[PDB]
Amino acid sequence: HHTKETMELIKELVSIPSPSGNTAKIINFIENYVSEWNVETKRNNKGALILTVKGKNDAQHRLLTAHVDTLGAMVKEIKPDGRLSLSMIGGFRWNSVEGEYCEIETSSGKTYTGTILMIEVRIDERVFSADEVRELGIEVGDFVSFDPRVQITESGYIKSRHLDDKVSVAILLKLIKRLQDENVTLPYTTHFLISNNENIPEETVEYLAVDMGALGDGSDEYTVSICAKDSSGPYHYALRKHLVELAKTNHIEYKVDIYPYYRAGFDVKHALIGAGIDSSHAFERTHESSIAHTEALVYAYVMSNLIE
Amino acid sequence: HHTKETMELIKELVSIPSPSGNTAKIINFIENYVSEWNVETKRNNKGALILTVKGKNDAQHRLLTAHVDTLGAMVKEIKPDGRLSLSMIGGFRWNSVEGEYCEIETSSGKTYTGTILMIEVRIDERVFSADEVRELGIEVGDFVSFDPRVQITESGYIKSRHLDDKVSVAILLKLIKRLQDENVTLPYTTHFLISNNEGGNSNIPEETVEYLAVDMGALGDGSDEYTVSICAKDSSGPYHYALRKHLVELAKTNHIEYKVDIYPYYRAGFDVKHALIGAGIDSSHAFERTHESSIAHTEALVYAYVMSNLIE
Amino acid sequence: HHTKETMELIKELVSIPSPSGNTAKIINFIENYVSEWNVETKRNNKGALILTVKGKNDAQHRLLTAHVDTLGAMVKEIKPDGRLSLSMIGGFRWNSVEGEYCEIETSSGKTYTGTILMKNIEVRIDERVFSADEVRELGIEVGDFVSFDPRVQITESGYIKSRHLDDKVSVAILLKLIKRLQDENVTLPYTTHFLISNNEEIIPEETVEYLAVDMGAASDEYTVSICAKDSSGPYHYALRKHLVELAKTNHIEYKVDIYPYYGRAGFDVKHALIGAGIDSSFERTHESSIAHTEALVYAYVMSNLIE
Numbered sequence: 001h002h003t004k005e006t007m008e009l010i011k012e013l014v015s016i017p018s019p020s021g022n023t024a025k026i027i028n029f030i031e032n033y034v035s036e037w038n039v040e041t042k043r044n045n046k047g048a049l050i051l052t053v054k055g056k057n058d059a060q061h062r063l064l065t066a067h068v069d070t071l072g073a074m075v076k077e078i079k080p081d082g083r084l085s086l087s088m089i090g091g092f093r094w095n096s097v098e099g100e101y102c103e104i105e106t107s108s109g110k111t112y113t114g115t116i117l118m119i120e121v122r123i124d125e126r127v128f129s130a131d132e133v134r135e136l137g138i139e140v141g142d143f144v145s146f147d148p149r150v151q152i153t154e155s156g157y158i159k160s161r162h163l164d165d166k167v168s169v170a171i172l173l174k175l176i177k178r179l180q181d182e183n184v185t186l187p188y189t190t191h192f193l194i195s196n197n198e199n200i201p202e203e204t205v206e207y208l209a210v211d212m213g214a215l216g217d218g219s220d221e222y223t224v225s226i227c228a229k230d231s232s233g234p235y236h237y238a239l240r241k242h243l244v245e246l247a248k249t250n251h252i253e254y255k256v257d258i259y260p261y262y263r264a265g266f267d268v269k270h271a272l273i274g275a276g277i278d279s280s281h282a283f284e285r286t287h288e289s290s291i292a293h294t295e296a297l298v299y300a301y302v303m304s305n306l307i308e
Numbered sequence: 309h310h311t312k313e314t315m316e317l318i319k320e321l322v323s324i325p326s327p328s329g330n331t332a333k334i335i336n337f338i339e340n341y342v343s344e345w346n347v348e349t350k351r352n353n354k355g356a357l358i359l360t361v362k363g364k365n366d367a368q369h370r371l372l373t374a375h376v377d378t379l380g381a382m383v384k385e386i387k388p389d390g391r392l393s394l395s396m397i398g399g400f401r402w403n404s405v406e407g408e409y410c411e412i413e414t415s416s417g418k419t420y421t422g423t424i425l426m427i428e429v430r431i432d433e434r435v436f437s438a439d440e441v442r443e444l445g446i447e448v449g450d451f452v453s454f455d456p457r458v459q460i461t462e463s464g465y466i467k468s469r470h471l472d473d474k475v476s477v478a479i480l481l482k483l484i485k486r487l488q489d490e491n492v493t494l495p496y497t498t499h500f501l502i503s504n505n506e507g508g509n510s511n512i513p514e515e516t517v518e519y520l521a522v523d524m525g526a527l528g529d530g531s532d533e534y535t536v537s538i539c540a541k542d543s544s545g546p547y548h549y550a551l552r553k554h555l556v557e558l559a560k561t562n563h564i565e566y567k568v569d570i571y572p573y574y575r576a577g578f579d580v581k582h583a584l585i586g587a588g589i590d591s592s593h594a595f596e597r598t599h600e601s602s603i604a605h606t607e608a609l610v611y612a613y614v615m616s617n618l619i620e
Numbered sequence: 621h622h623t624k625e626t627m628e629l630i631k632e633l634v635s636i637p638s639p640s641g642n643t644a645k646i647i648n649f650i651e652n653y654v655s656e657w658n659v660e661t662k663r664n665n666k667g668a669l670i671l672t673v674k675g676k677n678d679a680q681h682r683l684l685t686a687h688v689d690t691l692g693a694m695v696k697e698i699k700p701d702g703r704l705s706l707s708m709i710g711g712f713r714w715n716s717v718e719g720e721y722c723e724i725e726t727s728s729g730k731t732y733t734g735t736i737l738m739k740n741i742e743v744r745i746d747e748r749v750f751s752a753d754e755v756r757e758l759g760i761e762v763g764d765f766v767s768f769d770p771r772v773q774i775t776e777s778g779y780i781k782s783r784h785l786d787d788k789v790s791v792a793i794l795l796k797l798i799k800r801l802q803d804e805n806v807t808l809p810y811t812t813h814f815l816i817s818n819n820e821e822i823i824p825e826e827t828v829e830y831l832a833v834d835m836g837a838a839s840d841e842y843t844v845s846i847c848a849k850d851s852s853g854p855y856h857y858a859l860r861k862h863l864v865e866l867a868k869t870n871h872i873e874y875k876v877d878i879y880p881y882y883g884r885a886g887f888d889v890k891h892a893l894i895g896a897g898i899d900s901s902f903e904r905t906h907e908s909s910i911a912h913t914e915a916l917v918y919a920y921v922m923s924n925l926i927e
Contacts, residue, residue, distance in 0.1 A: 205353060217385060228449040229382055229395060233505070234329025236354075240449070241415060256449040258384045258395045264509040265577070267353045404719065407783065407902035409773070421775060423902060430899070432775045434906070457721070457771075461733060461746045469719055534748075590744065595719035595735055597744070 002174070003292045007158055009170040010150075014162040017103060017145030019072020019089045023047065023196040026068050030194060034173070038180050049194040051172075053179055055186030060306060061203045063268070064298070065193040066168035066210045071281070073144040075104065075121075078130045084114070084121035086144060090164075090198070094119050096282040100161070101147040106137035116146070156288040157221070163284040167275050167291065168210035169194060175298055190302055204268055205306055206239060210298065212274035212286075213259030220276045221286045223253040224293040227272040230262035236269040239307050243271060246300040252293045269307065273297060310482075311604045315466055317478040318458075322468055325411060325453030327380020327397045331355065331504040334376050338502060342481070346488050347500075352511065357502040359480075361487055363494035368618060369516040371580070372610070373501040374476035374523065375508060379593070383412065383429075383450040386438045392422070392429035394452060398506070402427050404594045408469065409455040414445035424454070464600035465533070471596040476522035476586055477502060479607055483614070498614055507575055516580055517618055518551065522610065524586035524598075525571030532588040533598045535565040536605040539584035542571040548581040550619050555583060558612040564605045581619065585609060623911045627774055629792040634784055637723060637767035639692020639709045643667065643818040646688050650816060653795065658802040669816040671798055675808030680925060681827040682812040683889075684917065686790035686834065687820040695724070695743075695764040698752045704734070704743035706766060710821040714741050716902070720783070721769040726759040736768070779841075781904040789896050789905065790833035791816060793914055797921070812921060823887065828925055829859060830889040833917060835898040836879025841905045843873045844912040847893035850882035856890045858926045863892060866919045872912050890926075 018026035027049050031041060034051065042050045055061075071090035079085055084104070088094070097116050104112045104123065114121040121144065127133050150160035158167075172192045179186065191201065200207075213230065226243050227235055240256075247254040255276070263270065275290040326334035335357055342349060348360040363370075379398030387393055392412070396402070405424050412420045412429065422429040429452065435441050458468040466475075480500045487494065499512065512519075524537065531537070538555050539547055559566040567588065576582065587602040638646040647667055654661060660672045691710035699705055704724070708714070717736050722743060724732045734743040743766065749755045772782040780789075794814050801808065813824060820834075836850060846863050847855055860876075867874040875897070884891070896905050896913045 229329065229397075234382065234397060234451075237330055237332070237451075244415075256447065258382065258448070260395065264505070264507075267511045269353055403715070406718075407716065409771070409781075423781065423904070425900065425902070430904070432777055432779050432781070432904075434777065459721070463747050465746050467721075467735065467746075591719075591737060595737065597735070599748070 003288045003295070006170055006174050006291055006295065007152055007288060009173065010158055010167055011152060013068070013166040013169060014148045014150045014160055017072070017105070018068050018070055019143055019145050020069035020197055021089060022105070022143040023069050027194070027196065030068070034176065037177065039176055044199065046196065048196045051176060051192040051194065053176060053186055053190050053192070055188040055190060057187060058189045059203060060188055060205050061201055062188045062190045062302065063193060063200060063204045063207045064172060064190065064210060064302070065195055065208070066172050067165050067195045067198060068169055069196045069198065070162055070164050070166070072146065073102070075138065075140055075142040075144060077140060078133045078138065080130055082123070082127045082129050082133050084123065084133070086119050086121060092281045097146055103145050103147065104138055105143050107139065107142070108137045110137050112136065112138070157285055159285045161283055163212065163277050163286065164281065165211045165274070167212065167277070167286060171210060171291070171295055171298060174295065175302070178299070184303070186302060187305065200266055200268070204266070207263065207266070207268045207270045208301065209270070209272040210274050211272060212277045212280060213262045214280040215257055216260055219278045220255050220290070221278050222289045223255045223276060224290060224297050225274055225276050226254055226256050227259055228256050230259040230272065232264065235271050239269045239271045242304070242307050243273060243297065243301060246304060247297060250296060250300050252296045252300070253289070254293065254297070311600055311607070314478050314482050314603055314607065315460055315600070317481060318466060318471070318475055319460060321474040321478055322456045322458045322471060325380070325413070326376055326378055327451055327453050328377035328505055329397060330380070330413070330451040331377050335502070335504060338376070338481070342484065345485065347484050354505065354509070356504045359484060359500040359502065361484060361494055361498050361500070363496040363498055365495060366497045367515060368496055369513055370496045370498045370614065371501060371512055371516045371519045372480060372498065372614070373503055373519070373521050374480050375473045375503045375506050376477055377504045377506060378470060378472040378474070380454060381452040383446065383448050383452060385448060386441050386446065387428065388438050390431070390435045390437050390441050392431060392441070392446070394427055394429065400593050404469070405454055411453050411455065412446060413451050413453070415447065415450070416445055418445050420444060420446065465597055467595070467597040469595040471589065471598070473523050475524065475589070475598060475603065479522060479603070479610060483607065483610055486611070494614060495617060510578070512578065516578070519578070519580045519582050520613065521582070521584040522586050523574070523584060524589040524592060525569070525573055526592040527569060528572050531590055531592070532567050532602070533590050534601045535567045535588060536602060536609045537567055537569045537586055537588045539571055540568050542574045542584065544575050547583050551581045551583050554616070554619050555585065555609065555613060558616060559609055562608060562612050564608045564612070565601070566605065566609070623907055623914070626792055626796050626910055626914065627780055627907060629795065630780060630789050631772050631774060633688070633788040633791055634770045634772045634782055637725070638688050638690055639765055639767050640689035640819060640822045641709060642725070642765040643689050647818060650688070650795070654798070657799060659798055666819060668818045671814040671816070673798065673801060673808055673812055675810040675812060677809060678811045679826055680810055681824050682810050682829050682831070682921070683815055683823055683827050684794055684812065684831045684833060684921070685815040685817055686794050687787045687817040688791055689818045689821050690767070690784050690786065691821065692768065693766040695760065695762050695766060697762060698755045698760065699742065700752060702745070702749040702751050702755045704745060704755070704760070706741060706743060714739065717768055723767050723769070724760055725765050727761060727764070728759055730759050732758060732760065734766070778907040779904055780907065781902070783902045785835070785898060785903040785905065786901055787834055789835065789910065793833060793910070793917060797914065797917055806922070808921060809924060823884070827889050829892065830884060831892045831894065831917070831920060833895050834893060835895040835901060836877070836882035837901045839897055839899045840875050840909070841897040841899050842908045843875045843897050844909065844916045845877045845895055845897050846874055847882070848876050848878055850879040850893065852883060855892055859890050859892045862923065862926055863894060863916070863920060866923060867916055870915060870919045872915050872919070874912065874916070
């Protein structure tokens with residue numbers, strides 16, 4: 001019921017285009033969504049969003065993050081035949097988007113539909129030349145989003161070519177709401193940063209990314225993934241050991257894994273967890289059970305003491 | 309006698325496993341080693357160690373750095389035969405660790421031995437399945453360290469596959485102890501940062517003006533294990549020219565044997581003049597070696613440097 | 621206690637360098653080790669040992685054998701920078717010795733330490749030398765033997781691991797077995813010869829059966845290996861069937877195996893091959909497989925010839 005409502009919000013969020021560079025509409029949608037809530041809200045100079053819940057101890061803070069920007073593409077050239085050429089936004093294989101339907105947003109704000117072909121866009125508009133295309137409003141620089149084909153299954157899976165990383169974004173939002181409905185008091189001021197590319201009060205002590213990577217083997221879409229290392233290196237040992245203990249104490253099904261394809265600069269202990277997706281940066285999927293387990297870890301985490 | 313002792317320290321240090329991500333033991337060991345000393349010490353949130361020796365001028369600061377974390381690996385998967393699969397910690401070639409003995413450390417801090425084969429671990433334990441391996445306490449996530457085969461040669465070389473940068477750590481430590489034993493006054497407050505995370509990272513008093521990495525690299529040329537190495541450029545780009553010219557002059561003034569090098573391997577966001585020196589290491593990252601005399605010249609240059617004025 | 625003493629000896633032998641061509645020291649060490657024993661000991665033109673124990677039957681002989689020579693290298697050229705260039709002794713792969721510590725013995729007995737690095741593979745000598753002249757000045761010369769540090773370790777868990785073994789395990793087995801026969805004063809049914817060779821990486825006329833104790837290349841390091849054939853071809857079928865019966869009879873854990881790369885082509889004798897189970901001929905075996913091997917040569921030795 002909780003988890004299902006969580007899944008509905010994923011669908012809502014994935015259904016709004018927000019490729020890196022063009023996330024305004026989704027940050028707004030989020031500003032309004034929490035606008036009645038208790039949480040203090042703050043928009044960056046970049047247009048990222050920081051949501052702060054005051055806690056008992058406001059001299060030491062905890063930071064959780066999840067990103068709303070997604071892969072996408074940009075119009076790099078209008079071809080003389082009127083098909084569009086694209087520059088990629090984010091790290092995928094073009095292969096995994098051949099034939100996807102997509103949308104093109106103009107400066108003006110008008111949108112058109114299209115299909116990705118091979119890298120071209122066949123626009124759904126009787127237009128046969130570069131001037132014809134321009135007449136439409138479309139220009140080099142325009143953002144192109146890929147239609148996410150989002151679907152929620154009765155057997156409890158959420159399937160889509162997004163989930164980069166809107167699952168986590170919903171989780172942080174439901175968590176915030178829950179603190180409120182239930183009058184939970186956080187032991188520490190905790191910031192939830194809803195970032196818009198793939199800044200931090202000086203008193204932040206711990207930093208948890210909520211996000212989801214690929215493995216190189218078997219994924220598990222039924223448990224929460226707690227990352228011990230990624231391509232930038234091992235995550236903070238002690239804090240990771242802490243999260244594992246939280247999971248066991250609370251009987252949350254988890255998995256400890258390495259993400260080989262995934263700050264350091266801020267004096268802060270870093271950890272990473274997220275739901276298990278499958279076939280990430282392509283056609284992506286996870287099951288309600290992983291989302292529940294993840295919801296439960298984040299809560300357990302946010303309620304624990306800072307590491308010794 | 310001084311330099312031989314320095315080497316003793318390297319050997320002790322190299323003998324504590326400490327691959328990036330799992331450097332607690334070694335940092336505690338260092339915290340202790342200096343615990344009676346006059347040097348103010350400070351652990352950050354990251355578990356890096358900052359050792360500070362106050363100087364005449366406490367308005368402008370000098371920062372020296374050297375790193376304690378080493379290469380290693382981590383258990384990425386327990387195979388159904390019972391043999392272990394590994395993710396790499398650091399930038400090396402697997403080749404250079406085929407048949408190394410290693411040590412697998414458990415959550416609960418239990419330890420087992422093994423051998424790297426071609427890339428997996430044959431654990432020195434009578435276990436034939438994923439299950440009986442886990443029975444041992446071993447789990448995906450566990451740190452694996454490569455046995456360093458450290459040895460000090462009567463002819464003055466120190467060798468191990470895997471010296472990493474613990475040569476430099478020993479040099480900073482002995483320098484700090486020398487400042488105290490001989491009652492020397494630093495001209496500037498000087499920070500010695502024992503980092504734990506190769507990039508790496510830092511956080512450092514706003515009044516730092518100069519930043520010297522003490523570390524060692526490979527050439528693409530072929531190294532010199534008898535002189536101190538002064539880096540003119542690496543992948544990040546050339547090092548601060550003037551400060552680098554300063555370091556060469558110190559070496560000449562003091563008759564320290566040096567070489568000016570380019571390291572085609574191994575950054576900036578802090579308004580700070582950067583330099584890099586270290587002993588010459590041979591076959592770096594692969595099977596490493598340096599000599600008594602290079603360590604002595606390096607000790608001498610670091611000292612001369614720390615006693616000099618900031619560049620005008 | 622018996623079995624861990626066998627591992628002590630193995631480690632002791634592995635710690636004496638002995639690559640093919642330069643085995644005097646170890647041969648001496650062995651020749652000394654048995655000097656007080658009840659066994660007839662005969663050195664050799666090639667410098668190998670033969671230890672003979674008389675039995676009941678002295679017109680039909682048995683021979684067991686194991687070798688003390690090992691992989692190694694020899695100095696092939698001293699390079700202009702003073703690094704050493706090597707020629708392989710034995711048949712291994714070069715990659716498998718990159719970064720290994722090694723030792724260089726001079727014509728006059730001086731030894732220097734070194735590291736192997738990269739057939740274009742060299743030795744970095746642990747000495748301040750910069751030229752052919754300075755190297756020779758140490759007394760190093762083309763022709764010098766080079767041995768690789770065996771890095772031998774016996775673990776609280778019962779494994780013995782090195783990068784040598786290959787055949788010193790067997791040598792210690794033959795050695796220890798010979799000893800116990802004169803301790804326990806049982807009588808061999810046959811005069812048997814124990815040949816300790818020094819050239820098997822590179823004998824009486826009344827001998828009937830020839831058992832080699834040696835190790836070849838998903839392995840099992842907890843059992844005695846009995847060889848059914850190797851690159852040379854099938855081992856005597858009758859005799860191997862015997863060694864298997866002998867194992868079952870005596871409840872020795874065994875595996876029957878084919879060494880596809882393992883090398884008396886034409887002396888008229890019945891041939892056999894067994895040995896402890898080696899992993900990756902960097903090498904390891906467990907003590908249980910040594911115990912199983914020890915029990916098997918014993919029963920073999922006490923057995924009767926086949927009709």
